[model samples]
Target chain A: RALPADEEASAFRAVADPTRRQILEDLRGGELAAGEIAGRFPISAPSISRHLGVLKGAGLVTERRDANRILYSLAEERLALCVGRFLSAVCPEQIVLRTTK
Target chain B: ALPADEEASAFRAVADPTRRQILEDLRGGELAAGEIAGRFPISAPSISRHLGVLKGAGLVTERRDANRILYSLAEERLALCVGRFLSAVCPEQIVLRTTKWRS
Candidate 1:
């Protein structure tokens, strides 16, 4: 239960940033390397790295090492689980409707 | 279109404790002013004020009946907006499947 709470906070924290949200949005269609993701923003690569670190900390995104590149992808279950729990807590009977894809 | 940023922060803010408690009461079903006020540790008027704030935020809806006013969840717009945005941002693939066993 606490894990869900932490993930909820993290999910909220990760998307709080416009740049980070945009990066996550770009990844929605497919996985992308750190460099490729950074190319979409006006910010520097290092800055994007910091945003990625925040997203990783929140469990919203996970990274993988592939040769010289680090690929990032959404951890959808964790995001959905946390949000689903929060919605249930606040609106139990409405959970099904809230959670529908 | 209005920027989604401020609404995002407001949603986070409303997720905090006392506000959450108010939401929980509404989940039990619709409640009127005194009924909602009685469940919390706070005073009746304070709860009434919180209800007002929630109503203003569009998180809850209200209807008046004499001295008592009823409040209930009006979350469809907010929930749909948030869910759609999250879906648009989350990655399509499950990349952490292998690492789950390691940690």
Candidate 2:
């Protein structure tokens, strides 16, 4: 999970969105083009495109051009989740997660 | 150190630059309310509000010191901080926050 602090904050901020989290989940299956990622969700193509931009900025995912589409892939090592601890301490009652398997 | 969808509000609590600064101040050891306000140029009431916000978010814990409340980085943080989540906004503080306190 080693990364710059600024990149780190943006990473968290980036993933904080439900849409972005799903996008990450989408990529987890494997790298995909913008069209494929956007297709998996109900949102408009433009909305998905914006999310991809934020994810790219945060360093959670990377983007590169391929022909007419953009392919995104996860920066796997940085995807480490350090959430439960923070929330568990801050708002245990608010949590919806039952510890991961 | 990234926050997830469930943590948006929690992230918002610490999103402020000033709050993050206060968080850093309380990193090494607990400090009285006054001590924290002393570091910033802002008014005490402002700091107080910020403290109230921090405590509200459970990002900070307030201890009873009678008239004076000593605040420290929450125990949860030293145990496991979202260093990567907050590295960008408060890099050095985040890194040292977890390691030094634990060390």
Candidate 3:
């Protein structure tokens, strides 16, 4: 399937914030509930939720409702696809050199 | 330097279509005001203003000669800084794994 027009832009938007990046890093090993994720940040839970919402909107993180809690995890596939496409677009030769040389 | 509230947002702002077109033009080397302006569908002054914003944002290196102004990509530094920042936040392994699975 073709990527949504705003998907790359959204991914870029999500990574633009350092706090959001921390949230993504925190989830690298596995998923965590919204509250658990919020407890790690200096920001309020609602602010954390907003950040997750942006990440979720960008397709970088997935959210699932488990009972009363919302769980978040790195959407590895989406992140990679977006980053790889961007790298290739910006510098295809780098990839070619790495692979072929 | 202080992380101005909108610095990151500014970078993302220029990543839009018209601005990206202007950036690509500069990728080939420096060009005169009119030369760069001619390539885009937008008006000349609009492009000139866009180039000015890009220069102000440190995304384009510029030079002046008489009445003509030349602009070229300042992406090397911008890319390096941004790429390094991104790498610090997201590990290569995670990025690679995600990419591989998607493909």
Candidate 4:
């Protein structure tokens, strides 16, 4: 239907921080247990958890329990959808670039 | 040099519903500041402020047409930011092949 305003704002606000972005980058290799994600950053585990919370709020990442551990994985399509819809709206012409790894 | 702050600003700027609408409106062509302000229901001052944020983020360019200020979409800057985000998060998923240019 129309634009998903809250979703777009959440994604943009979540990705605004460098720490949150790196958190996302870490997830691209697939899901990691919360502790696994926490270990990669220099910040304290709680801070890392806070960053993860922001990403989860944006729907850019999802968290689930596996045994005693909580795992987080990238919701890449959600991010792509948010960015793609925005680009399609304002810059449809330039949205054609090859999205290579 | 890639200014991370600038990219961050772009994200913040576009996060607002009104500013995104302004960007979409500019895509059709350049319009005077007053012309843009008139289309939105908000007060002209509020609209001007949103224009300032978009201009600050470099997503739109401003020009003076005599006494009026004109704004247009800065497509490359916008594409660059979006592309960088896509490349970082989901590079292989967004291969949009449509070359549909606006007539």
A66, model 3: CA deviation in Å?
3.4
lDDT over C-alpha atoms for residue B100 of model 1: 17
Q: Residue A24 of candidate 2: its Cα lDDT?
A: 70
Candidate 3, superposed: residue stretches over 4 Å from native: A1-4, A91-101, B1-15, B41-49, B93-103
DockQ of 4: 0.49
Q: Among the candidates, what TM-score does chain A have in each?
A: 0.79, 0.72, 0.82, 0.84
Best by lDDT: 4
Q: Write the per-residue lDDT of candidate 2 for residues A24-88, one digit (tens) a residue.
A: 75676678988888889998998998998988877778888888878999764544433333333
Candidate 1: misplaced stretches above 4 Å?
A: A44-46, A88-101, B1-10, B13-18, B31-53, B63-70, B87-103
lDDT of 3 by residue, A1-101 (tens): 33555676677668768777678768887999988898898888789989999999888888898888889888766765554455434433222112211
Per residue, candidate 2 scores C-alpha lDDT tens digits across B26-102 of: 65678999898889999999999998977766678878867899887764542233333433322222232333332
Using TM-score as the measure, the top candidate is 4
Looking at candidate 3 chain A, the ten consecutive residues that score lowest on lDDT are A92-101
Q: Give candidates' CA RMSD values in order.
A: 8.5, 8.8, 6.3, 4.1
Docking class of 1: incorrect
Better of 1 and 3 by DockQ: 3
Query: Candidate 2: which pairs clash?
Result: A5-B87, A5-B88, A6-B87, A6-B88, A12-B2, A12-B3, B1-B82, B1-B84, B1-B85, B2-B85
Clashing pairs in 1: none
- Can you write out model 1's per-residue Cα lDDT over B1-103, one digit (the tens) per residue? 2537545644554555566567766776788888887878888777777777677667788888899788887655445435455444432311112121332
True lDDT of residue A90, candidate 4: 81
DockQ of each: 0.13, 0.08, 0.16, 0.49
Candidate 1 lDDT tens digits, A22-98: 77678777789999988898888889999999988888788999998899997766766655555545543233323
